[PDB]
């Protein structure tokens, strides 16, 4: 089939700059059938572009596709807040008809570290037989951010869960939180927890703990 | 709407000129790219993604319509379903479709709370644990809506019972954790439970 591969995955920029997003073929697409789709958070994909250079009803000339054979083009000029969102390129040229992963246009904004938060289970639900500990990691930037949990310094593996906010509509920044899940057994049976976060932003990881039972 | 493993998941979509029209199905899963499924035209010649190893059919029909039949469903066709025409192309909205062996719960609610004392001046965060509910859709507000400023509530995230476990956070100055109250406002209408949870902290 023919895969696609979209440039560059994550694109960081500002409203009235331009936006260039590329979109590569493994093979040549001969009818030029590419289309670009916009998608927002918790919103259907809607259709951008088709034909690879016709652009779709609903969205204004600032919006123009371009290319034929392997390479492909969307260009966004005098970028709008709401022109922000994840951007799909599609071909359905050859079957079987396929999807690029998609380019993520953020608004780029300056280097901000998180703020990391660590709360132990509840004795609630600690009735229940289940320990959930929270690690929070508030508005940061860039989005990628790393969370290592320890359990008297044993590094835990397989046993936790991360979401991210969207980026958020006043600062720009993400957040995220992470959930180390344990048996009540398990988490009686030690002391220290840690959540330890690494982030560009940040000179050295910082460690947020606490000791079971104080 | 939702339906269990095993099962026959059936769509069909509304329906210009058929000897030129193609129909296409496609999919996202939550959290993922887009994902074509099948194509097909007025006569009924059929073509469809390798993966589904044909346990997808794809048929127009009489009727304005034009149907997809998944077979032997699984949690990875766990999905929302759009259905597109083709000559150019085009047709929002969407159907979400769940594919579980859990059943509907309601969520419980646990304090989300500093293990110490919190420093005065600086901030402290608290808030609320939802956890163990099905199906999706849960909502959290603050203070019945009076509390909207440096809230954070997270998507949920499917846990390996099945169940669905969301985090609801909140920032606040130090200086208040003794004049103002945090309750977080949790609602889940698939099981008709609404909890009302107080968060405190000391100081």
């Known amino acids: 089939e023919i895969v696609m591969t979209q440039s560059p995955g994550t694109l960081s920029l500002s409203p009235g700059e331009r936006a260039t997003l590329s979109c590569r073929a493994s093979?040549?697409?001969?009818?030029?059938?590419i289309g670009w789709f916009q998608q927002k958070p918790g919103q259907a994909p809607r259709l951008l572009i088709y034909?690879?250079?016709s652009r779709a009803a609903g969205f204004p000339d600032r919006f123009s596709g371009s290319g034929s054979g392997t390479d492909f083009t969307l260009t966004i000029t005098r970028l709008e807040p709401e022109d922000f969102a994840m951007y799909y390129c599609?071909?359905?040229?050859?079957?079987?008809?396929?999807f690029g992963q998609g380019t993520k246009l953020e608004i780029k904004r300056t280097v901000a570290a998180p703020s990391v938060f660590i709360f132990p289970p509840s004795d609630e639900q600690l009735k229940s037989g289940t320990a959930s500990v929270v690690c929070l990691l508030n508005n940061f930037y860039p989005r990628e951010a790393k969370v290592q949990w320890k359990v008297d310094n044993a590094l835990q593996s397989g046993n936790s869960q991360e979401s991210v906010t969207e980026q958020d509509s006043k600062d720009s920044t993400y957040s995220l939180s992470s959930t180390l899940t344990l048996s009540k057994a398990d988490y009686e049976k030690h002391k220290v927890y840690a959540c330890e976060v690494t982030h560009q932003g940040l000179r050295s990881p910082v460690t947020k703990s606490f000791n079971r039972g104080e | 709407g939702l339906l269990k493993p095993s099962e026959t998941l059936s769509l069909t979509c509304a329906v210009?000129?058929?000897?030129?029209?193609?129909w296409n199905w496609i999919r996202q899963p939550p959290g993922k790219g887009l994902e074509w499924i099948g194509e097909?035209?007025?006569?009924?010649?059929?073509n469809y993604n390798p993966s589904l190893k044909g346990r997808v059919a794809i048929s127009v029909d009489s009727k304005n319509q034009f149907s997809l039949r998944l077979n032997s469903v699984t949690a990875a066709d766990t999905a929302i379903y759009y259905c597109?025409?083709?000559?150019?192309?085009?047709?929002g909205k969407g159907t979400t479709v769940t594919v579980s062996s859990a059943s509907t719960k309601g969520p419980s609610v646990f304090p989300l709370a500093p293990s110490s004392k919190s420093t005065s001046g600086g901030t402290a965060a608290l808030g609320c644990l939802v956890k163990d509910y099905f199906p999706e859709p849960v909502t959290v507000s603050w203070n019945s809506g009076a509390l909207t400023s440096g809230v954070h509530t997270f998507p949920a995230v499917l846990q390996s019972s099945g169940l669905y476990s969301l985090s609801s956070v909140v920032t606040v100055p130090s200086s208040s954790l003794g004049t103002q109250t945090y309750i977080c406002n949790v609602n889940h209408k698939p099981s008709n439970t609404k909890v009302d949870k107080k968060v405190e902290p000391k100081s």
């Open positions: 597109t025409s083709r000559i150019w192309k085009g047709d």
């Open positions: 210009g000129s058929f000897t030129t029209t193609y």
């Open positions: 097909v035209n007025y006569s009924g010649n059929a």
């Open positions: 093979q040549s697409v001969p009818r030029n059938y």
């Open positions: 034909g690879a250079s």
């Open positions: 599609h071909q359905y040229d050859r079957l079987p008809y396929t």
